[PDB]
Amino acid sequence: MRQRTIVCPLIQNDGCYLLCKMADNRGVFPGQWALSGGGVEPGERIEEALRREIREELGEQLILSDITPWTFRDDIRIKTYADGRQEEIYMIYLIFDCVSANRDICINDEFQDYAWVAPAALALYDLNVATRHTLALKGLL
Secondary structure (H helix, E strand, O other): OEEEEEEEEEEEEOOEEEEEEEOOOOOOOOOOEEOOOEEOOOOOOHHHHHHHHHHHHHOOOOOEEEEEEEEEEEEEEEEEOOOOOEEEEEEEEEEEEEEEOOOOOOOOOOEEEEEEEOHHHHHHOOEOHHHHHHHHHHOOO
């Protein structure tokens, strides 16, 4: 029963949403599509954590017009060990609406590809579970 808080940006430009394709040895299923995001370090505000993770994962050339808190949600993930023993990980997600003023992306090693996706197409991507739950809540699927 361990605990993680994740800050997640939902980045939009010109009506399209940014999705990133996870690198081939990341995730339980490799090469799923996802929102970027990460944890909040001791000593940092949640918006400071968000902006740092954007720069790290998507590069310094991406210019944000604004960032607004949207909503939160939670999930339990199970980690199953080699002998079938399990541990639960309790995740809280803090989701921000982000509008970017441009589309210049430089992905880091966590990702292998990215796309700017029309809302109608989002559901059809092989989204990871977290990303599907988030976009579903937003009414985009």
